[PDB]
Ligand SMILES: Cc1ccsc1CNC(=O)c1ccccc1
Ligand SMILES: [Cl-]
């Protein structure tokens with residue numbers, strides 16, 4: 001029993017984490033086989049930050065302009081190339097600690113673990129979700145760029161996020177490991193702003209199912225709802241629309257608890273209307289939206 | 301920017317987790333140098349659990365009754381003995397992945413990372429506080445016994461917790477690595493209950509400082525208080541007493557943010573007496589007490605563990 005925001009064990013990623021220096025800029029890189037992946041903005045200078053021409057900046061660089069340090073070891077850069085917003089540094093050693101891995105681009109609402117890193121060394125691990133506005137609500141200081149987000153299915157690491165930058169509201173933006181940004185963002189210091197964020201409805205429902213599985217029913221009610229009436233109410237509270245896909249996805253949890261998905265939706269409508277009235281659900285006084293249906297089944 | 305519940309990187313401990321089987325029971329062990337540590341209740345049947353005599357249960361066992369798997373490699377057990385409530389299985393091979401480590405016993409209020417494991421395989425990592433009532437609010441399913449808790453300071457892993465059981469209210473109980481239970485619990489199937497818990501005051505204050513560092517300032521006010529005065533309020537609200545040692549430990553954050561501990565105590569006093577008035581702090585509608593002052597400083601400064 002119990003229900004906690006759990007991250008994946010970080011060790012398979014820790015063994016991949018290196019330091020990449022270009023000029024006066026140092027940040028983290030991800031070393032898999034003989035390639036080190038890092039944000040291309042490591043080659044930016046102070047005057048380049050608003051409208052850098054990365055192709056022009058990159059063509060001016062030689063392999064020895066990139067220092068890559070793995071623990072106490074310098075790796076030799078023998079090649080370089082850019083893919084979208086990530087730089088790929090060929091090195092002369094395959095990482096002996098390379099796990100089984102893949103690169104996966106995720107959809108808003110998906111969760112993943114973040115290994116926060118500074119100077120190529122891991123600081124801490126925590127759990128995040130891709131917000132509907134394609135930002136994440138991270139914990140990142142200066143020097144954290146190149147830190148990555150991942151899940152681990154069986155023994156295979158699915159890398160899904162690389163950290164690039166912090167927006168003015170203090171949330172974070174970044175790319176998949178093919179260097180494509182999540183959301184409309186660009187690796188330039190020109191004014192950018194996250195869109196208004198919304199609550200991940202399918203995840204809240206998942207987490208309500210988790211509370212039932214761990215023995216709490218106080219918030220249920222005798223009502224149901226049509227899917228359309230639920231969405232009409234929920235969007236007035238800035239919740240994301242719930243789709244038939246999401247309903248389908250909640251099937252297993254509905255069967256395990258015996259509570260129909262649209263019955264749970266009616267419980268959620270009431271909670272939005274009433275609040276908690278001094279009660280809590282799984283230790284929280286707010287509705288939690290950073291647990292997916294998949295997370296709930298794996299943890300419970 | 302940002303503030304998250306954050307565990308230590310778990311790789312150094314993942315390399316120490318093994319599978320331990322005795323009879324029909326499988327659970328986790330911790331393999332350090334040439335010893336595998338695990339809960340002594342691994343040797344009990346369900347009937348034994350009602351009133352175990354562990355030394356007597358142990359003498360029937362031979363080394364070859366303890367099946368130990370490290371990955372998909374069997375470890376050879378060449379000796380067994382108990383220390384308090386942990387069983388120590390001496391093996392013929394030192395763990396080549398043994399990190400620099402110590403066994404430490406933590407005090408209530410202190411935090412640590414739990415590496416939840418099943419069948420010797422790490423499955424998740426999360427942050428816990430040792431509660432004032434000596435339980436932890438963990439997330440454990442059947443098979444998780446022998447999972448461990450730890451801190452890292454420099455490159456030394458300080459092991460502080462081994463998971464043993466779940467109490468009827470769904471909270472969890474275990475020992476330090478020398479087999480001594482946290483709290484008034486015993487490893488037997490009998491009536492046991494968590495005592496009434498309290499809130500870790502020094503930790504809530506630390507979290508308020510974290511909020512301020514992150515620009516969350518609405519709860520600050522012009523007032524200050526005294527320790528005796530604030531501690532009467534704390535008692536009234538089932539909060540642990542605040543000592544001068546706590547005040548001194550918060551010193552750094554008081555100088556960094558310009559808010560004295562008794563100044564922030566006056567913020568907390570008002571929060572307890574009036575609530576939050578529909579607002580939140582660092583995304584929470586509850587006062588969070590599972591971050592220590594060290595946790596806040598370390599996360600708001602980027603300390604690392606290569
Ligand atoms: C997010 C982003 C986009 C283009 S650059 C960048 C982050 N990098 C810097 O802001 C910087 C670079 C060089 C010297 C000082 C600061
Ligand atoms: Cl996805």
Ligand code: NA
Nearest residue numbers: 017018071120
């Ligand atoms: Na490293």
Ligand code: NA
Nearest residue numbers: 521523563566
């Ligand atoms: Na004040």
